[PDB]
Enzyme design. Sequence first.
Site, short mmCIF file in Angstrom:
data_model
loop_
_atom_site.label_atom_id
_atom_site.label_comp_id
_atom_site.label_asym_id
_atom_site.label_seq_id
_atom_site.Cartn_x
_atom_site.Cartn_y
_atom_site.Cartn_z
N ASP A 111 30.38 2.69 -19.39
CA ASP A 111 31.27 3.13 -20.46
C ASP A 111 32.46 3.76 -19.75
O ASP A 111 32.38 4.09 -18.57
CB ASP A 111 30.58 4.14 -21.39
CG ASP A 111 31.28 4.27 -22.72
OD1 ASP A 111 30.80 5.04 -23.57
OD2 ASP A 111 32.33 3.61 -22.93
N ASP A 138 23.39 -0.98 -27.08
CA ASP A 138 22.98 0.08 -26.16
C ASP A 138 22.73 1.32 -27.01
O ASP A 138 23.37 1.51 -28.05
CB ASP A 138 24.06 0.40 -25.13
CG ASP A 138 25.10 1.38 -25.66
OD1 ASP A 138 26.13 0.93 -26.19
OD2 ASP A 138 24.87 2.60 -25.55
N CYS A 181 2.10 -5.37 -29.10
CA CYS A 181 2.91 -5.19 -27.91
C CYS A 181 2.23 -5.65 -26.62
O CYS A 181 1.06 -5.34 -26.38
CB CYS A 181 3.30 -3.72 -27.79
SG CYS A 181 4.31 -3.35 -26.36
N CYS A 217 3.34 -4.88 -23.52
CA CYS A 217 3.81 -4.10 -22.38
C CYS A 217 2.62 -3.59 -21.57
O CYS A 217 1.49 -3.55 -22.06
CB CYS A 217 4.71 -2.94 -22.83
SG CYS A 217 3.89 -1.37 -23.24
N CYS A 246 0.50 -0.66 -23.23
CA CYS A 246 -0.41 -1.04 -24.30
C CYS A 246 -1.59 -1.85 -23.80
O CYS A 246 -2.60 -1.98 -24.49
CB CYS A 246 0.35 -1.82 -25.38
SG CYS A 246 1.49 -0.78 -26.31
N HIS A 301 6.99 1.80 -22.84
CA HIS A 301 6.62 1.08 -24.06
C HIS A 301 7.82 0.88 -24.98
O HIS A 301 8.05 -0.23 -25.47
CB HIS A 301 5.54 1.82 -24.86
CG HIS A 301 5.42 1.32 -26.26
ND1 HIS A 301 4.82 0.12 -26.58
CD2 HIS A 301 5.92 1.81 -27.43
CE1 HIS A 301 4.96 -0.11 -27.87
NE2 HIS A 301 5.63 0.89 -28.41
C1 LIG Z 1 28.93 4.85 -26.09
C2 LIG Z 1 29.61 4.78 -27.48
C3 LIG Z 1 28.88 4.88 -28.71
C4 LIG Z 1 29.53 4.81 -29.98
C5 LIG Z 1 30.95 4.63 -30.04
C6 LIG Z 1 31.71 4.53 -28.83
C7 LIG Z 1 33.24 4.34 -28.75
O1 LIG Z 1 33.86 4.27 -29.82
N1 LIG Z 1 33.82 4.26 -27.55
C8 LIG Z 1 33.13 4.33 -26.39
N2 LIG Z 1 33.77 4.25 -25.24
N3 LIG Z 1 31.82 4.49 -26.38
C9 LIG Z 1 31.05 4.60 -27.54
ZN LIG Z 2 3.66 -1.33 -25.56
#
Ligand SMILES: Cc1cccc2c(=O)nc(N)[nH]c12
Ligand SMILES: [Zn+2]
Lengths: 364, 364
Positions: free
Chosen positions: B92, B262, B300, B302, B305, B331
């Site tokens: 990021d 993420d 699951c 994994c 489990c 897990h």
């Molecule tokens: C990690 C994250 C979550 C949620 C929103 C954002 C965003 O708007 N800009 C960046 N750089 N990162 C974000």
């Molecule tokens: Zn599991």
Amino acid sequence: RPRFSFSIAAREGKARTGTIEMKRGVIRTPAFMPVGTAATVKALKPETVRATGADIILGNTYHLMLRPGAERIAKLGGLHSFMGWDRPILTDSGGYQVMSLTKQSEEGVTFKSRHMLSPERSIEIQHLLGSDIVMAFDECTPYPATPSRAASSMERSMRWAKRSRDAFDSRKEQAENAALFGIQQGSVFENLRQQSADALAEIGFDGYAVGGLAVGEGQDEMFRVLDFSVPMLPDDKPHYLMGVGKPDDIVGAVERGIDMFDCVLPTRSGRNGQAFTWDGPINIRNARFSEDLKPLDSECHCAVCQKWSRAYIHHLIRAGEILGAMLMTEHNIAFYQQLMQKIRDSISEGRFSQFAQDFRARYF
Amino acid sequence: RPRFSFSIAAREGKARTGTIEMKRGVIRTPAFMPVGTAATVKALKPETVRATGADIILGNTYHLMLRPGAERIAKLGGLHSFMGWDRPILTDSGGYQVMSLTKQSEEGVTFKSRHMLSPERSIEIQHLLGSDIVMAFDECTPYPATPSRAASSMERSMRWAKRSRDAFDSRKEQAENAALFGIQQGSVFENLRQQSADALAEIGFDGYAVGGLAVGEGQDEMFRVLDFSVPMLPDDKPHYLMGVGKPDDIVGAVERGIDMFDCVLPTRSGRNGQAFTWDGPINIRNARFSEDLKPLDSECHCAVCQKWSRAYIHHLIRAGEILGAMLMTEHNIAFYQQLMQKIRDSISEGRFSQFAQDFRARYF
Ligand SMILES: Cc1cccc2c(=O)nc(N)[nH]c12
Ligand SMILES: [Zn+2]
Ligand SMILES: Cc1cccc2c(=O)nc(N)[nH]c12
Ligand SMILES: [Zn+2]
């Protein structure tokens, strides 16, 4: 495999190397047992503990009887199934832990959440846990101790040793599948150690532990006591030095006839930033390791030293990251197991005395 | 392999499944990226992260620039070598973290230990870390936001997007080996999202993230915004929904055209006692699991489990044991990766819509 069979393959001076065959597996001696207090060797999966070379681990009657409970673990299938370790497990009797972490009497000990512990209940708890090597319920004499207090405590322990033997033998399943070790007491006094050794031999056990040490006395004093204490124990049975683990302590103890060891140093100090190396321990948190790309130890063949640098682990520990604890702990236990392997091989080859000398020279 | 190549193999409605080929490996999409803030996916070795099925992980410019330092990591060989993960890593830009964990201006942001961050320095830090997918330096608009504030922030982000593009392109090694993703802003307003999407497309990026969401707005609102926002982005490039991770959130986002995700939920909630299952999440600390011998989740596959019971993990977490964190985290990430695999396969087979319906029915 047999319930229990200790065989000595080679010797050098007072040192011995061999094996203990049990139903759940073979234990190579001299052996080091990682400690797993709350049904877990801290920060390590059982397979990782095995990967380091451990043949057996130590569990505790005290901690487990409190949480999650002995009867509960039994209901769940036993400690082995519970934590996922299918090899031998030695369990301490809980006596020492109680008087470390209370009403004491000839019947046992009571502690506060009022719980009671006696020779009979201790043996029953270890049975419920499914322990392979059961320790007799004893009283670890505080150091230093006057001869009078040392005697009283040792005498009580011997009476409790007899009670432990009978409790263990009265339970068919346990007597046929597990082993029972007696514990020698007597502080640092030769006459008391002799009386204790004789009382234990008269009762008869599968192994004999040297208790009452690693409680505040320096290495010099510990060695002095081992010098006359280990020869008092039956030669054809394993000799277990409880709570002893520092590298140099272990080498010296083996030189004096000890076959088994346990201690929280590898794990606990590992999580604190202390890493063991052949050139002595280092504190990975120190600034001098911030950009050190070398592995924890230059010769270590553990998975951690094959993959990560001191710099990375330094970062993890200072950041309080769990992976830091995981990596430090795996390396330390692997280092300990490598030390035991070197000890075993040197004894087998008749060059242990030289190995001890070389080890001390570089480690210090 | 090529520096970057996103290929769409199958579609269903707005959903897509395919791959992103990069020099360090292939990323299967839709994809979920475990978060590794301080150069570590908390409580997991990189090999365990890979074993769960992860093709790529997320690193942070903010945390690492502070500790252990961007220049230092570069000197040590880069983030990949440092933490031991040799596959793709998306980083990021640090902007969002700064305004979450300060002096803001058109030039960038300054924070306190006075550190400065700008589009140019952000890109340089990601270069020093050796990031494979570099995120443009933006400003994540707080929720809720007035149209005026949302516009001002979005406009600044677009100017910073241009600066990020140029900074990235001026560094030969980075431009030839890494990829650059732009970030759409505009809060929940359609006209601003449109302007942002158009500005980003005009500049040109390897991928487009939908930023500004997962900042307090409910799922209903998030979905409403995605409904009109994702179609604004170039169809032939990956669509990355930042910070979004809850199972049902992910399914709904994929249904709306998202290819990458993420979030710290799997890891963080895992350490807190929350385990994900197909029947919804459960809090393993609850007393009802004290003697539950079933695995975290009945289906699951994994490693956790396959080996340990809810009862054991329940014990570990209530005891504050590190292994508890390790097992819960493995897990959860494995569950997330299994969810992504099911999503990918269902899309490939033209039965994703049905999978989403079935998933919601049982999960809720
Ligand atoms: C990690 C994250 C979550 C949620 C929103 C954002 C965003 O708007 N800009 C960046 N750089 N990162 C974000
Ligand atoms: Zn599991
Ligand atoms: C674990 C330990 C360390 C050190 C000494 C002792 C002892 O004397 N008795 C018992 N039961 N345990 C001990
Ligand atoms: Zn090592």
